[PDB]
């Protein structure tokens, strides 16, 4: 039963993830990005249930959903398994802010808290620094102060009737960690001409490896504790093969097909540490994915969000994401081999993630976020 | 060897290197055609390297011989590391120079406090990794079985012996397995295991060779 709500919720994500991915890359050229396409779906499903007419049909098209009959069950399902668990520290947040001078539907700011978990909050938009600070604060309290300054006052005015803030944080513990004493600056090829030295983590990992010809890249999958979360790295065979890989990654299936060539092996991984903080304009991005009526006056038709079935549209939609990759993990701390540590020395084939790559967190069959690293 | 010094060229002639495209373990030449090592260092293809000083370069004086026969103790357990001793018959007899010599087997089960020399090309960092070019030596005493068992409850048998320092700092590490623990000209131990390397309260556990003398003598003589 619930299999027809999840293996259906996985198909939508893959379409949206691949779409959200290309758009952010096209918005932040020549730089590192990180985004959570998955976390933006619930607010849209929450928004497709206030928006009526051609607005609803546009959102449902993009969300890859049939109707808002199943949209509620998909998110009411997703909303009953949304806390913590083993291996990683994922922090997904989403909220709608409607100008204080608005009368919303009292009953459905509950089907928002009891199906979407969120609440619809009124804030004095006329007070940019008071309204902007109040927003950054709920986002800063929801991410343990990991994501501060989500919105800026030069983006608000009481022209602004509504804003959609979205925050996602990630930092995980490997199934088997890297030693800090083993981290040193090693080469990284920013380009076929350039080569810099970056703090590169060295360590052996029991990973799932795959040489993918269709992408002209190498796919490695390193697992975090519990074996539910996995770091997906697709390294192009060419130093500059990244923008060419992005193109092939526009195929929502290129990943599933790449994960079937994936085999189990023990290799010495050489991974650079990396942090990425990306502030995405979901308005611009989503509007470039065929969802323009939501952020458009008189076309949005947010007559269910309100008690009065009145004039409303979205003014802003931000996404701030923060990934963090380091040596942190499991299996004690230093000369770490096995139970009783035999004094033997086993060397494994080396895999150097020494060129621009695409990554992604797979939290059990579903990529919760992704991006690309051009220079750590 | 974590926390040791560099041995003088030729002071440890009995020390060999097990190789398979890279140094993975050590061993001891007990006669011109038999190397004694640890069982967990087993590999179906092993080339014994005698005469070695600097592992990462060919100085000209070395002797690379193939392990024709590789005999692990019948009772070697992979999970407890009991009976962690292996016999290697060299594909051909080796020249016994001042660079390649044979160690004598134990004539006595050495007492606690006996000063021993432990050598190898293994890791030199207790936390991290560092492979030495030249052989490393370490002067380490045999610890009381009482301190050995207290350091690892239920993990020590009558065939194991802890050699090292309880305060850590100086121990054997990854790559030294199978290696020599010579006390008064007699191979009393074989580098086996321990929790981490050079960690306080975690001395290195080695194979107590005085319990395999008959076995080492009987197997060789018969094969």
Curated annotation (Swiss-Prot), chain A:
Keyword rRNA processing: no
Record's note on what induces expression: By bacterial infection.
Residue positions with a glycan: 69
Tissue expression from the record: Hemolymph.
CDD domains in alphabetical order: serpin1K-like
Keyword terms: Glycoprotein, Protease inhibitor, Secreted, Serine protease inhibitor, Signal
Cited Pfam families: Serpin
InterPro entries recorded: Serpin_CS, Serpin_dom, Serpin_fam, Serpin_sf, Serpin_sf_1, Serpin_sf_2
GO molecular function: serine-type endopeptidase inhibitor activity
PROSITE patterns in alphabetical order: SERPIN
Localization annotation: Secreted, Extracellular space
Swiss-Prot/TrEMBL GO biological process terms: response to bacterium
Site entry (Reactive bond), positions: 343-344
Family: Belongs to the serpin family.
Protein name: Alaserpin
Organism listed in the record: Manduca sexta (Tobacco hawkmoth)
From Swiss-Prot, chain B:
Cofactor(s) required for function per UniProt: Ca(2+)
Catalytic reaction equation(s): Preferential cleavage: Arg-|-Xaa, Lys-|-Xaa
UniProt cofactor note: Binds 1 Ca(2+) ion per subunit.
GO BP terms: collagen catabolic process; digestion; proteolysis; response to nutrient
GO CC annotations on file: extracellular region; extracellular space
The enzyme's E.C. designation: 3.4.21.4
Major site of localization recorded for this protein: secreted
Subcellular location: Secreted, Extracellular space
Coiled coil: none
Bridged cysteine pairs (disulfide): 7-137, 25-41, 109-210, 116-183, 148-162, 173-197
Site features described as Required for specificity, chain residue numbers: 171
GO molecular function, one term: calcium ion binding
Binding site for Ca(2+): 52, 54, 57, 62
Protein keywords: Calcium, Digestion, Disulfide bond, Hydrolase, Metal-binding, Protease, Secreted, Serine protease, Signal, Zymogen
Catalytic residues identified in the record: 40 (charge relay system), 84 (charge relay system), 177 (charge relay system)
Pfam families recorded: Trypsin
Residue ranges occupied by any Peptidase S1 domain in the UniProt entry: 1-221
Family: Belongs to the peptidase S1 family.
Protein name as annotated: Anionic trypsin-2
Gene name linked to the record: Prss2
